[PDB]
């Protein structure tokens, strides 16, 4: 006598059991694919964010030239009026 803890197995008839063995792989394969599909989506958004950082740093370093250019021009215009009043 045995006592287990679905329970069947005596005479050969309708299976109804291979499904619960196949339907488990379907949920397992769709779970691995789900983990694979999420990894592809977030990795592509990571690279897309990197391609945006190189553009922000491009515009940032270009804004430094615009600010430094306004200072260089401001000094040059001051040297223009400074040398005009003393030498003339």
């Amino acid at each position: 006598x045995x006592x287990x803890x679905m329970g069947r197995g005596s005479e050969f008839m309708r299976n109804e059991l291979e499904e619960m063995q196949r339907r488990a792989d379907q949920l397992a394969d769709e779970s691995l694919e789900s983990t694979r599909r999420m990894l592809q989506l977030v990795e592509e958004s990571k690279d897309a964010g990197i391609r945006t950082l190189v553009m922000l740093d491009e515009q940032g370093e270009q804004l430094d030239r615009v600010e430094e250019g306004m200072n260089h021009i401001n000094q040059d215009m001051k040297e223009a009026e400074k040398n005009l009043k003393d030498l003339g």
Binding site: E43, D47, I50, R51, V54, E58
Partner: protein, 139 residues
């Protein structure tokens, strides 16, 4: 794996005002000859199209699957204006009697993806810094 990898070193020097592309060595390249080895040489292409002086090539190594170039190249460009550009690194097998065999390639730029894009990113962030990394040839 498969077609091998290439050791590339990128650096932007503000004292020179240009990108310093360095081809150091390659490992496990694809044998494209009948003797079991290959004659590898690295060609560098940094331009989208009409380039006057953007085709750089390394010296052709003799019968080697693991070459060692230890070379550096210089591309003249404005102060960090390599975002729109993308460096294409190609490895070829030199054939005297026919067209050269294509071993593998590499793409470094904003158009790249994964390890190739990150190598191009860290080169533009830290100026006057030598950044080197391995890249798998082709896909």
């Amino acid at each position: 794996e498969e077609r091998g990898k290439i050791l590339v070193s990128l650096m932007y020097s503000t004292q020179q005002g240009g990108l310093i592309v360095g081809i150091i060595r390659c490992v496990h390249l694809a044998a494209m000859d009948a003797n079991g080895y290959s004659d590898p040489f690295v060609k560098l292409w940094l331009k989208p199209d009409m380039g006057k002086k953007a085709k750089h090539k390394t010296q052709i190594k003799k019968k080697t699957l693991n070459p060692e170039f230890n070379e550096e190249f210089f591309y003249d460009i404005k102060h960090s204006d390599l975002a729109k550009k993308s460096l294409d690194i190609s490895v070829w097998d030199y054939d005297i009697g026919k067209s050269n065999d294509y071993i593998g390639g590499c793409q470094l730029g904003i158009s790249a993806k994964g390890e190739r894009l990150k190598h191009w990113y860290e080169c533009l962030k830290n100026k006057d810094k030598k950044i080197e990394r391995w890249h798998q040839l082709q896909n």
